[PDB]
Each structure stands twice: as C-alpha cells, then as structure tokens.
C-alpha cells in the first residue's frame, strides 16, 4: 500500500581532531539499506540490506561519487554556517538533513519533503508545493536568497517527483519478499506483584512490522491513562519492533481489565484478558 | 538514489 523512502545526513564538527564526521544513511519505510561513514576506510556506499546487493558496480560508483560530493559540500557548508552565525571556530556544531518521497499504492506521488537543521533546530525547508523555501531565521534567508537566484527548488522537485519515485519502485520490486509483506504482532500478557494486594499487569506485543501500533489499557469498557506506564516503540534486531504497556491493579479486579492491540497485520483488533 | 547536494 502506502510506502515511503528517506535519506538522513549528519555532519558534526570536531575542532582539533581534523576533518569533521559525516554520517549518511538511506532508509526505506522502516528498513535501512545503505550507509556512508566519512571515517571508514572503504570510503564507499556500503549496503545494509540483502536485496540491494543486486545492483552492479555502476550503481555503487555513482552513489559514492555523489555522497562524497555531499561530505565535501556540507563540510564546506559548516564553515559558512559559523560566520553566518558569527560563532567560534573552536566550537562544535551539528548539521543534519532529511528529504525523501512518499508514494501511494500505485507508485503515485503523494508528498515530498526537504529540510536542513543546524544544531537540533530547523534552518531551511521546502514547502509542500516543492517550489518555495521557508527560511527559519535571518542567517537562513541569506542562504534562502542563494537558492532563489539558483532554481534549486525546480531541481529537488524534479528529484522527488522523478528520480526518487522512479527509483523507489525499483527497490520495492527488488525486495518484494521483505519490504512489501507486513508481519503481525505476537501478543501475550504477563503478571507481576508488588504488594500483598497490588499487582502490575503488562501487555506485550513483540515482532511486528511496521512500527506504527497502538496499545490501549482499558478498564470495563472505558479507556484509562492513570497509572499506565508506556514506553516508546523500540527495535528488535532482526527487523521487527517491540512495545509494552503496563498498569498497576489491586488483587481481585484483574478479571476486569482488558488490553487491545490495533495493528495492520491483524485484520481484527485483538482484545486480551486475564 | 542519493540526491544532488547544494551549498549555502
């Protein structure tokens, strides 16, 4: 159905330690498939997925040339970012980047993003129309007016509408056994006591795909949030995601509580009990 | 595919 693709960059300056560190990874919906490390001896666009190894040497010779084009452009960019903000040369800062295309169930273009970020806060962005910029501060309108004289938006848009989408359907076809099949969550419930009458229930759901899920601890047909410990969804290591939701109960009422797991792989929302 | 990168 609906899928997406992202590309993440991370430039971090290290004064007194030589050239800064550039880290770039490539993401499909929830699966990383390429990576680049500026401090790696290979200096190539190494893969991080099985289905992507099919691409010939011309693919890796091209991706590598235009990700090293980025490390030298973003390092060049880091010095310019300092004198734009009049910061100290002996200081460390972080420059990030994110943009990719979102496709529908037919490979049809749906939305497009483009955002840079200097030290955790947004710097510049591309609007939804993919032809206009939105600078965050005055030091970014300096850059914004640079990418207005040069029609940068009409090239990035030509990428997201074009190269991004036309290339993404190639990835979905090359790995249809992995990226297109959604695993269901395996569910079960635990029980932990604390006091002589207070106990702690916990609803579990391990090993699913994708990450978007909702765990709901109800109580007699009415939802509950008081005394409901909830941790954010975490990865597993194989390509799946785990998530639990806890609740403290008194001894005697455990038969009243209920847990619900709403996900895609289950064509019915399960309703657990004790 | 990696995209084309520009400077500030």
């Amino acid at each position: 159905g609906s899928h997406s693709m992202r590309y993440f960059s991370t430039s971090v300056s290290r004064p007194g330690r030589g050239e800064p560190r550039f880290i770039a990874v490539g993401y499909v919906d929830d699966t990383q498939f390429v990576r680049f490390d500026s401090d790696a001896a290979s200096q190539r666009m190494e893969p991080r997925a099985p289905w992507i190894e099919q691409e010939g040497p011309e693919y890796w010779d091209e991706e590598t040339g235009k990700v090293k084009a980025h490390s030298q452009t973003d390092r060049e960019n880091l010095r310019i970012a300092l004198r734009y903000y009049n910061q100290s040369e002996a200081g460390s800062h972080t420059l990030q980047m994110m943009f990719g295309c979102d496709v529908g169930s037919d490979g049809r273009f749906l939305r497009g993003y483009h955002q840079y970020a200097y030290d955790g806060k947004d710097y510049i962005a591309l609007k939804e129309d993919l032809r206009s910029w939105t600078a965050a501060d005055m030091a970014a309108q300096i850059t914004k007016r640079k990418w207005e004289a040069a029609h940068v938006a009409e090239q990035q848009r030509a990428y997201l509408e074009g190269t991004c989408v036309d290339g993404l359907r190639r990835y979905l076809e090359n790995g249809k056994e992995t990226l297109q099949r959604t695993d269901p969550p395996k569910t079960h419930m635990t029980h932990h006591p604390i006091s002589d009458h207070e106990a702690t229930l916990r609803c579990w759901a391990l090993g699913f795909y994708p990450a978007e899920i909702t765990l709901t601890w109800q109580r007699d047909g009415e939802d509950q949030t008081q005394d409901t410990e909830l941790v954010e969804t975490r990865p597993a290591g194989d390509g799946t995601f785990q998530k639990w939701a806890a609740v403290v109960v008194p001894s005697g009422e455990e038969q009243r509580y209920t847990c619900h797991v709403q996900h895609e792989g289950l064509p019915k929302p399960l309703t657990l009990r004790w | 595919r990696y995209p084309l990168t520009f400077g500030w």
Partner: T-cell receptor
Amino acid sequence: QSVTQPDIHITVSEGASLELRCNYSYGATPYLFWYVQSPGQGLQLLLKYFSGDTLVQGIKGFEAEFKRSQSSFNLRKPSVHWSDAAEYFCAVVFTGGGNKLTFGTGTQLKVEL
Amino acid sequence: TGVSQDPRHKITKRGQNVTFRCDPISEHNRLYWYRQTLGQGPEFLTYFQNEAQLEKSRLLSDRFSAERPKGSFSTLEIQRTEQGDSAMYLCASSLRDRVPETQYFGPGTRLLVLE
C-alpha cells in the same frame, strides 16, 4: 540510460533550415546542453535548459525547443552559415545518476556553398 | 572565461609517463576530466569538487593519476602509456551552485603514442 542522436551526418547548402535531434531516455528530467567541436579545438557551449521556457535561444543564432512529451531537445538555425561546419554533440546530465556529462553519438555537419 | 590547459599537443613512445596541467576559471569549485577518442564522443574519466576526488570511471586502470591538490588547478598523470590511450584530454569546470550545472571546456590536450 543513454542519449540518442539520430542525425549522424548532414550536408546542406548555405542558408537552409537546419534541425539536429537529441532525445533522452523517456523518464528522466535531466539538464540539457548542446556543444560544438571544430576539428582542431575543444567543445563550445551553445544552449541549455532547465529553467522552464521550452524554447531557448543562444549563440550563433541557434535555437532549441524542449518537448517533455516527446523527450527531445533539437537544435535549430533558420539560415545556416558556411562557418557552421563542425561536429555537434548534445550533452545531458543524468540527474540522479550523478553530475557527469553524458554525451551523444556525434553529429558531423558539412555545408555547401 | 575561460578554462586553460597546458600543453595542447604532445607525443611519446609507449612505456614512459606523461603529465598535463589544467587551470580552470576563478572561483569554480568543480572540475571534470574527459577523454575524447579520435572521431568519437568524449568519455568520462574523473571529476573533482574542491581538491578531493569523487569518481573514476571503473573502465579505467590505476595507471591513470589525477589530482587537484591546491583546490584550483588539476594535474593528470598516466603511467605505462600505450596506443590505446592516444586521444584528446579536455578539462572542464563548473560551479555546482548553478542549477543547470553548466560545464565549460578548455582547448584540450591531444596526445599520440607510437612504438
């Protein structure tokens, strides 16, 4: 993917309508160029198009129209000169594949007086 | 304008080395190297952005040696020259901030190898 120059060799008289074709591979939105190489010296840029005005004018009186429906970027000159006798290459930048120039097969043009 | 090269023509016997020295235009931070065989299209060899190498046509060998150490000028070097390497080597520069990404070529360097 590749670019194609169908006109391999043309010989016309001085003052004739000229058109050299250069079609790209149906799917990309590349940068477009047209170069000329006299037999002795190097290349020389003539035109370019990515801004969004389909018809582009340039040096030596040459024009060009961009037709995404046909995926063509054709050279034109309503009246060819005798000095226009040289090889004519068209260059595209295959955008997602990088920034290296991808040249055509090479059109060699002679003019007759 | 414009891009410069030195020298323009030369010729050597196979077995020795050659070296060409290119000079692009002011404030241009990208430089490509191309080779054009006789009567054919220019083939892509290598391309720079700011003193560091980004790509090399894998259909080449390690005998070719290019470098742009000072950030402006580039120098090509070829070891173990052969007749199969005789062609015209053309320097080309760009700006990387022009969205059409215009590459401007120089007069080039024609070579010839014999026995």
